[PDB]
C-alpha cells in the first residue's frame, strides 16, 4: 500500500548498515510506496555512494533531490513507519571504500617530532694459522630527524683494521597522501621493473602500495557480476575458502581478493535469496608487472647517477615509468629514460589470460653513446610467462626470455669512463626458468635455470639448479643439485647438497616445560663433485622464559678438493633485551680461529626525554606509561619498559591499526592501569605515542555497608587521598587501585551520601588484592 507524502523522523539505513537519524521529506513519486525520499548528492556521497560512478549526478544543484531510483539502476528505498526506519539499498558497484581493511586517510597519524639514532657496535678477532693475529671493529650509525611529516635520515659507518669514517647515505622523505605517493629527496633508488634500477642523488615522486589496504595490494582478478536480490558472494581458491561477504541487489565489483598469483583458479559462487546460485570460475595466473584493475603505479625521477662504481661517471638524468590496470585483466605500461649520452623509451602490454596463464611483453628502444664516443641504436624485447598451480600440481612460476639487438645498451653501459667488464661483448639473449612440481602430499620438485648468449663470442652463461624437498612428519628433508657454466672461465661448477631438519617440539609432551621443545637438530652435507666434501651436524633454538636468547651450535668437517682437510665448529648467541641487543659468535676452521662480539640498539629523543631499546625500524611506537617499570609489551620479544615506564617498539605496521598492549602479568603487584590496551594508526616513519595510565598503590575490593545493608549497585565511589575512583557492583563491592595504606572514601548515588574510612594492617603490602569491609555515615 501507498503512504501519504510528508516529513518523517526516521533511521536511515543503507544496505542493512545504519547511517544517520534525520527528518526525511517524502514526495509523491514513481515508487511502490507512492513516495520517494528526498536526498542530496552531498548526503548520498557521504553515506558511501561514489557519485562519479553514476551518470548525471554531477549536473544536479547542491540541494536538488536526487531521483535515486531512475538515476541508479537497481537502487531501492523502503519506508517503515512502524520502526521509524528508512532502508536504502544501492548496488555496491556504485559504492566507494568497499575494500576490507579500509582505513580513512585522516586517521593516519604523522606522529611526534623527535630525534632518532640506531647504533650497532660490532667487532671480531682472528687467529690465523701462520701470520699471527688480527682485530676488527665496525660501528654503524643510522641517524634520524622527524619534523611533522618529514623524515630526515642518515647512514654513516666507522671501521677498524689492524680506519675511517666512511659516510654512506642521506635522504629527506615525506608522503603526499592526496596523491597516495612518497616524495624522496637526496640519495634514493629506482625500481627494476622496466629499466634496470639505478642508484641516484636527486628527487623522486612515486606512488606507494603501502598506503593501500592489504586486501587490494598486488594483482588479483577483479570480479564483475550482478546479484538479482540480496546475495551471498563466496570465493574459493586452492580448495580452501578465500572470500565471503553479502551484497545488495544490482551490479557488484569485487576488488578485494588478496594477491595469490600462484595459488590457482578462483571458484566464485553467488548464492541468492531463493537458494539459486551462479557458479563460475575465474582463472588466476600472474606476472610481476600486472596491475589490479584501475590501479596506477607511477614514478618520476630526476638526479645524478651514483652507482658507487669508481670506474663510472655521474650523469644527470630523467626517468619516469607508468603502469596501469585496465578491465578484463589487461595492463598497459611503459616509461622513458633521458640523459645526455642515452635516451630510452619502453612500452608494454600484459594480460592475465585465464586458462592459458599470464603474459607480458614489452619493448625498449635505446639510443646510446658509448665511452669511445660512438653512437648506437638498439632494441630489447622481453616476454614473461606465468602459469599458477595446476590440477596436476605444476606451478610454472616464471618463464622469461629477453632478447637484445647488437646496438642495444642500458643506461649503466654509458656511464662508464673507458670501453674495456667489456662493452664490445654486450648480452644478446636471456632465458630464465622456474618451475615447481607437487609429488604427492609431502614432496616438491624444484627446477630453475638461466642461459645468456652474447654478441661477439659464442660463449654462453648456463646455470641450472634442481632440488627435491620432502616432509616426513615434522622433519624436512632436502636434496639439491646445481651446475653453473660461466662465460669468462673454463670447466663446470657443481654442488650436490643434502639437508635434514628435525624439530624436537613434537618429541615431548605438549605441556612440556623443557627448553628442548624450542630446539631442533640439523644435519647437512656438501659435495662439489670435484673431490671436496663437507658435512655439518648442529643444534639451534631459543632459551629463557621470554625466548630473547637465540643459539646456534654446529660442528662438522670438510676434506678434499683443494687439498684442505680438517674439522670445523661454529657457534652464535644472540640476545634481544630491554635496552638493546648483544651477539657473540665463535668460529673454528682448523686454520683460522675467530671470535665475534657485538652490541646494537635504538635511541629516541622526544618531548619526555631519551628512551633506549632494541634498534628501530622506520615506524616507531613510543610506549608512555609512567609508573610501569619492568612492564613487558605483548608480541615484541624482549621489549620491556625502562625504569621510567618508557619503551620504544622495534615493530609496527604503517597505515594500519596497531594494537599496543602491556602484559598485565608482568606488572608490579601494586600497579594497575586504566587501560592495558592502546591502539595507533601511524604513517611510514612516524613516531607515535601509546599512552597508558598507571595507578600505583594498594589494590582493594571493598564491601561497603550502610545500616548493615550493602551500598546499592551503580554507586560512584571516589577517594580523598588519591586520584583513584570506582563503581559499586554486587554485594556492595567496589574495586580500587592506586590506594594508600589508610584513607577516607567518598560515595555518592543520589543528589554526596555515605563516607567510609579504612586502615589496612601494614602486613598486607605483598598481596595482590586485599578485601576489607567499611561502615558508613548516619
Amino acid at each position: 500500500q501507498e503512504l501519504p507524502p510528508g516529513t518523517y523522523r526516521v533511521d536511515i539505513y543503507l544496505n542493512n548498515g545504519y547511517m544517520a537519524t534525520r527528518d526525511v521529506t517524502f514526495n509523491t513519486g514513481d515508487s511502490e510506496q507512492g513516495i520517494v525520499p528526498c536526498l542530496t548528492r552531498a548526503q548520498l556521497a557521504s553515506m558511501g555512494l561514489n557519485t562519479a560512478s553514476v551518470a548525471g549526478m554531477n549536473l544536479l544543484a547542491d540541494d536538488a533531490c536526487v531521483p535515486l531510483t531512475t538515476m541508479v539502476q537497481d537502487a531501492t528505498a523502503h519506508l517503515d513507519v512502524g520502526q521509524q526506519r528508512l532502508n536504502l539499498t544501492i548496488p555496491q558497484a556504485f559504492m566507494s571504500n568497499r575494500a576490507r581493511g579500509y582505513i580513512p586517510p585522516e586517521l593516519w597519524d604523522p606522529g611526534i617530532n623527535a630525534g632518532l639514532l640506531n647504533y650497532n657496535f660490532s667487532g671480531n678477532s682472528v687467529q690465523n694459522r701462520i701470520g699471527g693475529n688480527s682485530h676488527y671493529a665496525y660501528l654503524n650509525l643510522q641517524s634520524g630527524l622527524n619534523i611533522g611529516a618529514w623524515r630526515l635520515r642518515d647512514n654513516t659507518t666507522w671501521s677498524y683494521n689492524s680506519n675511517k669514517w666512511q659516510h654512506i647515505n642521506t635522504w629527506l622523505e615525506r608522503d603526499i597522501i592526496p596523491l597516495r605517493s612518497r616524495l624522496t629527496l637526496g640519495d634514493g633508488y629506482t625500481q627494476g621493473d622496466i629499466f634496470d634500477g639505478i642508484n641516484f642523488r636527486g628527487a623522486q615522486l612515486a606512488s606507494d602500495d603501502n598506503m593501500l589496504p592489504d586486501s587490494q595490494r598486488g594483482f588479483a582478478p577483479v570480479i564483475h557480476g550482478i546479484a538479482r536480490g540480496t546475495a551471498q558472494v563466496t570465493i574459493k581458491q586452492n580448495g580452501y575458502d578465500i572470500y565471503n561477504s553479502t551484497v545488495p541487489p544490482g551490479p557488484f565489483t569485487i576488488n578485494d581478493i588478496y594477491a595469490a598469483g600462484n595459488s590457482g583458479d578462483l571458484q566464485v559462487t553467488i548464492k541468492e535469496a531463493d537458494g539459486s546460485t551462479q557458479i563460475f570460475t575465474v582463472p588466476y595466473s600472474s606476472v610481476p608487472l600486472l596491475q589490479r584493475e584501475g590501479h596506477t603505479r607511477y614514478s618520476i625521477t630526476a638526479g645524478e647517477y651514483r652507482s658507487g662504481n669508481a670506474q663510472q661517471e655521474k650523469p644527470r638524468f630523467f626517468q619516469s615509468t607508468l603502469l596501469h590496470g585496465l578491465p578484463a585483466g589487461w595492463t598497459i605500461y611503459g616509461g622513458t629514460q633521458l640523459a645526455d649520452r642515452y635516451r630510452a623509451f619502453n612500452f608494454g602490454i600484459g594480460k592475465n589470460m585465464g586458462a592459458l596463464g599470464a603474459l607480458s611483453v614489452d619493448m625498449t628502444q635505446a639510443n646510446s653513446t658509448l665511452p669511445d664516443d660512438s653512437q648506437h641504436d638498439g632494441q630489447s624485447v622481453r616476454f614473461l610467462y606465468n602459469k599458477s598451480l595446476n590440477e596436476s600440481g605444476t606451478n610454472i612460476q616464471l618463464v622469461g626470455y629477453r632478447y637484445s639487438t647488437s646496438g642495444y645498451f642500458n643506461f649503466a653501459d654509458t656511464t662508464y669512463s673507458r670501453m674495456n667488464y667489456n662493452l664490445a661483448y654486450n648480452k644478446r639473449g636471456k632465458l630464465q626458468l622456474t618451475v615447481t612440481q607437487q609429488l604427492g602430499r609431502t614432496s616438491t620438485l624444484y627446477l630453475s635455470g638461466s642461459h645468456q648468449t652474447y654478441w661477439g663470442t659464442s660463449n654462453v652463461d648456463e646455470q641450472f639448479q634442481a632440488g627435491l624437498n620432502t616432509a616426513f612428519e615434522d622433519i624436512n628433508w632436502t636434496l639439491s643439485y646445481s651446475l653453473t657454466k660461466n662465460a669468462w672461465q673454463k670447466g663446470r661448477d657443481q654442488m650436490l647438497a643434502l639437508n635434514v631438519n628435525i624439530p624436537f617440539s613434537h618429541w615431548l609432551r605438549s605441556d612440556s616445560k623443557s627448553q628442548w621443545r624450542h630446539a631442533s637438530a640439523s644435519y647437512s652435507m656438501s659435495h662439489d663433485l670435484n673431490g671436496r666434501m663437507t658435512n655439518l651436524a648442529g643444534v639451534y633454538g631459543t632459551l629463557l622464559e621470554d625466548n630473547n636468547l637465540s643459539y646456534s651450535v654446529q660442528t662438522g668437517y670438510a676434506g678434499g678438493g683443494d687439498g684442505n682437510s680438517g674439522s670445523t665448529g661454529y657457534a652464535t648467541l644472540n640476545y634481544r633485551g630491554g635496552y638493546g641487543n648483544a651477539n657473540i659468535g665463535y668460529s673454528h676452521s682448523d686454520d683460522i680461529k675467530q671470535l665475534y662480539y657485538g652490541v646494537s640498539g635504538g635511541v629516541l629523543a622526544h618531548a619526555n626525554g631519551v628512551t633506549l631499546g632494541q634498534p628501530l625500524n622506520d615506524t616507531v611506537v613510543l610506549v608512555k606509561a609512567p609508573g610501569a617499570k619492568d612492564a613487558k609489551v605483548e608480541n615484541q620479544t624482549g621489549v620491556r619498559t625502562d625504569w621510567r615506564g618508557y619503551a620504544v617498539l622495534p615493530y609496527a605496521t604503517e597505515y594500519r591499526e596497531n594494537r599496543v598492549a602491556l602484559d598485565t602479568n608482568t606488572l608490579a603487584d601494586n600497579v594497575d592501569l586504566d587501560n592495558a590496551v592502546a591502539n595507533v594508526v601511524p604513517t611510514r616513519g612516524a613516531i607515535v605515542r601509546a599512552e597508558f595510565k598507571a595507578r600505583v598503590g594498594i589494590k582493594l575490593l571493598m564491601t561497603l555497608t550502610h545500616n548493615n545493608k550493602p551500598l546499592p549497585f551503580g554507586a560512584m565511589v571516589t577517594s580523598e587521598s588519591s586520584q583513584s575512583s570506582g563503581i559499586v557492583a554486587d554485594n556492595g563491592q567496589v574495586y580500587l587501585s592506586g590506594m594508600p595504606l589508610a584513607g577516607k572514601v567518598q560515595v555518592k548515588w543520589g543528589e554526596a551520601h555515605c563516607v567510609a574510612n579504612y586502615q589496612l594492617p601494614p602486613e598486607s603490602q605483598q598481596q595482590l588484592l586485599t578485601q576489607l569491609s567499611a561502615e558508613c555515615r548516619s
Binding site: S510, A661, G726, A729, D730, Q733, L768, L769
Partner: protein, 201 residues
C-alpha cells in the same frame, strides 16, 4: 557490540592471573561492563576474582580483564574444575528517552573457565581419544577417564546428529534417542579437533 577475545579460558595452577580480552567495536556506544565468576552451580564463590568487576567503556576500545586465582589450593589437584566467566554489557541509560516507553537489552557473554592443575600425567591434546561410549535403551552415555572436561561436538549415531555434551573429568554424561558413533571435540583454542570413531566399553 561487546565481544570477548576467547570462548574459553584455561587457568594454569600456580599462575597469579590470566588475561581475557574485552572488545567494543561500537564507536558511538557507551557500556557499563560487569564481569563475574560463578562455580558449576551458579554461585559467585570468590574462588576467582575478575578485575575490574565493573567499569565504563566508550567507543572502539579493547580492555584487559585480569582474572586472579583466589583459591588457596582448595581445588582438586587430579582433575579440572569448571567455572563460568560472565561478561554483562549494560547499555547506557538516556535521559533523552525517560518520558517514553523503552526496552533495553544487556548482552552477556558466558564462557567456560577451567582450573587446570599442574602435572597431569596425561597431556591435554591426548584426552579426546580416551572417550568411551555405552548405548542402552534411549540414552548414549559418554565416559571420560581423563582429568579434562570434554566439549564433545557434532556427535553422530549414524546420520543422526545428537545433543552436544560436556563430559566431566573422570565422570560421565548422557544424551538421547535410540548405529556407529563419530565425534569431534573443541580444544583449548576453541577449535574443532578431527573426527574420531567412538569406542565402546
Amino acid at each position: 557490540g561487546v565481544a570477548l577475545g576467547a570462548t574459553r579460558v584455561i587457568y594454569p595452577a600456580g599462575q597469579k592471573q590470566v588475561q581475557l580480552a574485552v572488545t567494543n567495536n561500537d564507536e558511538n556506544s557507551t557500556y557499563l561492563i560487569q564481569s563475574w565468576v560463578e562455580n558449576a552451580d551458579g554461585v559467585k564463590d570468590g574462588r576467582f576474582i575478575v578485575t575490574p568487576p565493573l567499569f565504563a567503556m566508550k567507543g572502539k576500545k579493547e580492555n584487559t580483564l585480569r582474572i586472579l586465582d583466589a583459591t588457596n589450593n582448595q581445588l582438586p589437584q587430579d582433575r579440572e574444575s569448571l567455572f563460568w566467566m560472565n561478561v554483562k554489557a549494560i547499555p547506557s541509560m538516556d535521559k533523552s528517552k525517560l518520558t517514553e516507553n523503552t526496552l533495553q537489552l544487556a548482552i552477556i557473554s558466558r564462557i567456560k573457565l577451567y582450573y587446570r592443575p599442574a602435572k597431569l600425567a596425561l597431556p591435554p591434546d591426548q584426552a579426546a581419544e580416551k572417550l568411551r561410549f555405552r548405548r542402552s535403551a534411549n540414552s548414549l552415555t559418554l565416559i571420560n577417564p581423563t582429568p579434562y572436561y570434554l566439549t564433545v561436538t557434532e556427535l553422530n549415531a549414524g546420520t543422526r546428529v545428537l545433543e552436544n555434551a560436556l563430559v566431566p573429568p573422570m565422570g560421565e554424561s548422557a544424551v538421547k534417542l535410540p548405529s556407529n558413533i563419530t565425534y569431534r571435540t573443541i580444544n583449548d583454542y576453541g577449535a574443532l579437533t578431527p573426527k574420531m570413531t567412538g569406542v565402546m566399553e
